[PDB]
Design a protein around this ligand. Structure first.
Ligand SMILES: C[S@@+](CC[C@H](N)C(=O)[O-])C[C@H]1O[C@@H](n2cnc3c(N)ncnc32)[C@H](O)[C@@H]1O
Ligand SMILES: COc1cccc2c(=O)ccoc12
Length: 254
């Protein structure tokens, strides 16, 4: 299985964004649309809200925070890769080399009923993100020495399957994310099903191939109660990954 040090050195953030999030009718854009609709449902319709949301394994992406910034005063973004956090920071600071998220932002504005336009939505997200932190989900203290208040919600999109080499580590990671959550707080996970790798160009990265039953069992083992669980059949392009759909779940910490 891919060593975690490979993420520091070989995960190219700009290449990842170009391959998966350009949003130019690709499998990658169909998956992105589905993820955005579910995140809108959770944070805007279901009213998952609070003072603090921690996004775990954010990579260099912000799409997973666009609806969340309407419901949370503060968002903390985290990743194992320092290069990924620097790419995020380019967008947060509105630096010239920042990735163009405007088609994704417009799509979320449309989903939300065109209450606001792209620039207002972006400013709301930029104001919500106060901290950009290193994290390691495999550790009992994922945020290391950095203290944070217990969060109202922990979100993790397409991270846990890449971070966990086996099922015991995956259950342990759910427990470690739980240490960041307030009692009764929400856990929101979205990831690929039955995927054993993903590609960024010629660079291969391992993935833990879990089925829906093993994911649900691990969340219950780790001390959560599931509110809803959805499986989609849509898979990534054959050149990208070997998954059999994706899942999304919302649970509460016991
Ligand atoms: C496939 S990307 C998902 C990125 C983003 N959340 C998205 O939805 O596109 C996997 C992310 O997991 C991060 N990662 C890998 N191992 C990790 C670990 N042990 N702890 C935290 N993050 C880790 C990588 O650095 C990378 O940003
Ligand atoms: C967009 O990122 C991905 C694309 C496809 C598959 C995976 C995976 O199996 C684990 C982590 O990330 C993935």
């Amino acid at each position: 299985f891919t060593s975690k040090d490979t993420y520091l050195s070989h995960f190219n953030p700009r290449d990842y964004l170009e391959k998966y999030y350009k949003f130019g009718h690709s499998a990658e854009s169909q998956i992105l649309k589905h993820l955005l609709k579910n995140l809108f449902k959770i944070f805007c319709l279901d009213g998952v809200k609070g003072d603090l949301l921690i996004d775990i394994g954010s990579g260099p992406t912000i799409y997973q925070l666009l609806s969340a910034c309407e419901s949370f005063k503060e968002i903390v973004v985290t990743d194992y890769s320092d290069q990924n956090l620097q790419e995020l920071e380019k967008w947060l600071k509105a630096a010239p080399a920042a990735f163009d998220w405007s088609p994704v932002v417009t799509y979320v504005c449309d989903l939300e009923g065109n209450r606001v336009k792209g620039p207002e939505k972006e400013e709301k997200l930029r104001q919500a993100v106060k901290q950009v932190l290193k994290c390691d989900v495999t550790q009992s203290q994922p945020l290391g020495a950095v203290p944070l208040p217990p969060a109202d919600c922990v979100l993790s999109t397409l991270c846990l399957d890449a971070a966990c080499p086996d099922l015991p580590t995956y259950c342990r990671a759910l427990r470690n994310l739980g240490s960041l959550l307030k009692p009764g707080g929400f856990l929101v996970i979205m990831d690929a099903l039955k995927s054993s790798y993903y590609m960024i160009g010629e660079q291969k990265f391992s993935s833990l191939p879990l089925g829906r039953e093993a994911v649900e069992a691990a969340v219950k083992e780790a001390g959560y109660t599931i509110e809803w669980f959805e499986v989609i059949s849509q898979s990534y392009s054959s050149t990208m990954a070997n998954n059999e759909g994706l899942f999304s779940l919302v649970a509460r910490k016991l």
